[PDB]
Amino acid sequence: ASSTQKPAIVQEEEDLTASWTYFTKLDAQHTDDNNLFYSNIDEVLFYMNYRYDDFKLLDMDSTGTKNFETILSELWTALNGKKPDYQLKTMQSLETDKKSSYFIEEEQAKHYQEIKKELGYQTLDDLLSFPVKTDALIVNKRYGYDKSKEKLTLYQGIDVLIEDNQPFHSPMNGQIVSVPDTETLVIEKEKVARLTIRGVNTLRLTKGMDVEEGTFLGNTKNSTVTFQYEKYKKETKDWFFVNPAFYFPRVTYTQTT
Amino acid sequence: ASSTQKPAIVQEEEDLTASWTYFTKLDAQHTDDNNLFYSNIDEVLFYMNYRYDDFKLLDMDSTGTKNFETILSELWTALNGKKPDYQLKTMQSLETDKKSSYFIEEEQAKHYQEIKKELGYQTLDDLLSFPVKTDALIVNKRYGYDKSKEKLTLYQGIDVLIEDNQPFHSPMNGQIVSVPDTETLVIEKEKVARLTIRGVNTLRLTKGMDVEEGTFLGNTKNSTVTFQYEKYKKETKDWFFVNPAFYFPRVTYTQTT
């Protein structure tokens, strides 16, 4: 009862990444010559999971009249406003506005923040260990949509900054299933998860070799490493991309509004 | 990047509708007493966007000798043949002809089709929600040109099949800016988008009312509802029609060759 605590994130993994991506679509579509949007989508997703539990983008709200894409779009407007004179608010601000739809009562909000901090995304399956000694990966290109060369583009991974060719250890246990070139490897846990790593020297690795979490793979080749992460969907015997950032202990985003 | 994915639709919205409309002009011009053409223009547009990115009808192709109107006209002939013995083909079939300018290697064809399924037109701005509970609007009169009375006509909207006397909810957030008659309303998101709805009784509705996505507007009068949708061009301070079908989650076209 009061001894029972729901996790900070309860959505299924595919829906969690889909909801992230939907919000990056709204950021990217409003990004133009005069405005660059990189909302704090983590704060959005923690709020949405607290309010709406294990929602899917096409489920209906409590009125029965709108789906969660619409709810997310309305939230985007509450945070960022509209052309020409956009606004910039935080989720915390909306959650403390007593007239707002997003309001959370003072005492409940203390508990909500504690659980968000204590549990985070660490209840997801198939978490990834840091590949270097650090307290947070610095993410200079987040997952999802953005504008690049004035054009909408979907980035199905994350770019991370790794200084000084640090020795790079595997984030996951699995088998090396592909070594396409000298700087790309694919590690797969059969029918579970698949991690693609770009930017690490692969000279001491061949297809079929088993690696464990922490196995040294090689030194980082330049300053950026790219991760892509996929989960397996038994129902259709295929794979879907997930946002890798959710699966490491902590990241720091360098792109912000 | 291998981690970078372009959308299924890359064209600007005005160019996308203009390309649709051009193809409907070709279908309508060749429709006669013995042949009625309603090509699968969605398949055309997804192929063209994959092959030629954010093209405009009057742009020249890479050879510099033909514009995209000419390319679309040549494709119509490849898909449909010529008088007096028309022969219907599919876009996917044309992509396997190694002697044709439409060839796409098998893997890339499968991949762009998968992206078409995942993304569709959902990367366009200012999407519309279904006005009733459904997985697809049945469109029995599509946007663009057709023949009526052996006369060419341009239809700047779509007609959708909805059961008569059924509750109808708003596809869009905005203000009711016009209530012309007891069966017509116009909703405007100011200087963004304008939605005309014909066939919903508007007696509970007044000019100046705010609506959200999902707001009950009224019950349907007849067995179809007509939508028109316009976007705003700040450069000229005017509006232009777009094909409304692109903006809903899914449609089913009843008019086929």
Author numbering:
A (entry chain A): 273 to 529
B (entry chain B): 1 to 257
Text lifted from the article:
In the T4SS from the enterococcal conjugative plasmid pCF10, PrgK is known to be the active cell wall degrading enzyme. It has three predicted extracellular hydrolase domains: metallo-peptidase (LytM), soluble lytic transglycosylase (SLT), and cysteine, histidine-dependent amidohydrolases/peptidases (CHAP). The pCF10-encoded PrgK is essential for conjugation and belongs to the DELTA family of larger PG-degrading enzymes. To conclude, we here show that PrgK, an essential cell wall degrading enzyme of the pCF10 T4SS, has muramidase activity instead of the lytic transglycosylase activity that has been shown for other T4SS cell wall degrading enzymes.
Therefore, we directed our efforts toward the extracytoplasmic region (PrgKEC), as well as its individual LytM, SLT, and CHAP domains. The His and Asp residues that are important for catalysis are only conserved in active homologs, but not in PrgKLytM and other degenerate homologs. The crystal structure of LytM superimposes well onto the AF model with an r.m.s.d. of 0.43 Å. Only one structural homolog was found in the PDB by using Foldseek, which is the geneproduct 13 (gp13) cell-wall degrading enzyme of bacteriophage Φ29 (54). gp13 consists of two domains, one N-terminal lysozyme-like domain that is homologous to the MUR domain (RMSD of 1.5 Å), and a C-terminal LytM domain (RMSD to PrgKLytM of 2.4 Å). However, the muropeptide profiles of the PrgKSLT-CHAP:C766A, H828A and PrgKEC:C766A, H828A fractions after incubation with cell-wall extract are similar to their wild-type counterparts. In line with this result, the LytM and CHAP domains showed no activity against the sacculi.
